[PDB]
Amino acid sequence: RKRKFGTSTPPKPKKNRE
Amino acid sequence: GTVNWSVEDIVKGINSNNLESQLQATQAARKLLSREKQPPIDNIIRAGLIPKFVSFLGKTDCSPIQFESAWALTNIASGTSEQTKAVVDGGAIPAFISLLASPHAHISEQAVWALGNIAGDGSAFRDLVIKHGAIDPLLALLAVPDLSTLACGYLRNLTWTLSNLCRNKNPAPPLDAVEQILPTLVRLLHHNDPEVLADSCWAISYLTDGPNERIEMVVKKGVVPQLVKLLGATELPIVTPALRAIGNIVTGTDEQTQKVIDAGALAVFPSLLTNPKTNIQKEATWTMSNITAGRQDQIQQVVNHGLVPFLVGVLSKADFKTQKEAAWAITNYTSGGTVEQIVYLVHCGIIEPLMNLLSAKDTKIIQVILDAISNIFQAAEKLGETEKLSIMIEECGGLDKIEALQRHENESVYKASLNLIEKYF
């Protein structure tokens, strides 16, 4: 009966350097 | 000097046979690609500039053009998968890996950043970055007695790139790469910088999302106590990934879940289950649902920590998704629990909120609730108290709900509701 999965948001996959 | 150039002027400067003119044009391109709104990435790619930047990456005698081209390519690789692919197709991966050993910290940092973007595109480019040999020099950059001697931004970028190398799951990262990275990840997980801690926790959460063997690789390193500590942190950016990792771990075997329990995690769930952040409440209730799907001694640990009233609370009032997770937790509890544990659950007041939730329009939660009711009724049977539970379900208005469910679209709802009405009512 164990069910696997599927700022506080997860880190961005990509990041621009401004 | 190099501000607001045209792509045509940049091309003219880069196509000149003058290294200094090429450097000025490359800096102009960097400044164009680092502007606030609408950087002309596609126009830069169309002009054929990526191979020139990649070649500039190897100009050891002109560190400025190395840095400028690394920055420009980093910003191109930060865009669409096609733009990142354009950077990769220019041969940038091995060039950036070579730059990882530069004596200039800002250039090696930019190389780390670019590889982070490339790996963050997805699993194929992640695995390609790994195949080119990025992990060894990346980890060498962190091979110092004390991480506090490194610049904060440098360390944060290294941590983020490593976390991207742990990310994505179709396929998951190569097992050998995960084993090679894990010790440094534990080191970072014990660092004092909140951003480093957050990204390290996110990497651990990536690595724990999958088959129980991956969970085991992570748990064998002894990180669960630190994860529980971070679960107790005041900063939500740290609590969120720590809670994700703990939930992932308790989706595994009963022994891994027991590792989580022995570390003291349950003592934190009174707060998590009442946390003002909806996502925290939802994921904590999901974690609880997977813990209630465990052994009877683990359900008993849930009971001893006083968490059943908190499950009643979440079931009574919360975002609907959290209430669905709580329904799952209740059904697992009643499926695996002793008769005494189910009696305790009823004495805490689960029946009324369980019944009030049967008016939802989501079929899954209705099935889950009806199955929980069946399990509680079986416990009552074993106790010869079926009629009393019947009366309780009638008083709070659940009988009418079940009767209405007798005429429902889904076949399982139909059957279960009619079985309940005909066997207990």
Residue numbers in the entry:
A (entry chain B): 277 to 282, 297 to 308
B (entry chain A): 72 to 496
Lines from the paper:
In the best characterized pathway, importin (IMP) α bridges cargoes bearing basic, classical nuclear localization signals (cNLSs) to IMPβ1, which mediates transport through the nuclear pore complex. IMPα recognizes three types of cNLSs via two binding sites: the major binding site accommodates monopartite cNLSs, the minor binding site recognizes atypical cNLSs, while bipartite cNLSs simultaneously interact with both major and minor sites. We combined bioinformatic, biochemical, functional, and structural approaches to study this phenomenon, using polyomaviruses (PyVs) large tumor antigens (LTAs) as a model. We addressed this possibility by x‐ray crystallography, and solved the structures of putative bipartite cNLS peptides of MWPyV, STLPyV, WUPyV, KIPyV, and MCPyV LTAs bound to IMPα2ΔIBB.
For MCPyV LTA, nuclear import so far has been believed to rely on a monopartite cNLS (NLSm: 274‐PFSRKRK‐280). However, our structural and biochemical data suggest that MCPyV LTA NLSm could also function as a bipartite cNLS, together with the monopartite cNLS located 20 aas downstream (NLSct: 300‐PPKPKKNRE‐308). Strikingly, all other tested cNLS peptides bound as bipartite cNLSs (NLSbip), occupying both the minor and major binding sites of IMPα2ΔIBB with their upstream and downstream basic clusters, respectively. For all bipartite cNLSs, the IMPα2ΔIBB P2 major site pocket is occupied by a K residue, forming hydrogen bonds with IMPα2ΔIBB residues and a salt bridge with D192, whereas the P2’ minor site pocket is occupied by an R residue, forming hydrogen bonds with IMPα2ΔIBB residues and a salt bridge with E396. To this end, several expression plasmids were used to transfect HEK293A cells, before CLSM imaging and quantitative analysis of nuclear localization levels. As expected, GFP‐MCPyV LTA NLSbip localized to the nucleus to higher levels with respect to GFP‐MCPyV LTA NLSm. Consistent with the subcellular localization data, MCPyV LTA NLSbip bound to IMPα2ΔIBB with higher affinity than MCPyV LTA NLSm. Furthermore, the K280T substitution completely abrogated IMPα2ΔIBB binding to MCPyV LTA NLSm but not NLSbip. MCPyV LTA is unique in that it contains two cNLSs which preferentially work as a bipartite cNLS, with the upstream NLSm binding the minor and the downstream NLSct binding the major IMPα binding sites, respectively. The increased interaction interface observed in the bipartite cNLS structure reflects the increased binding affinity observed for this peptide in our binding assays with IMPαΔIBB isoforms. We identified for the first time a hybrid bipartite NLS in MCPyV LTA, formed by two basic stretches of aas which can either simultaneously bind the IMPα minor and major binding sites as a bipartite cNLS, or, upon deletion of the genetic sequence encoding for the downstream basic residues, selectively bind to the IMPα minor binding site.
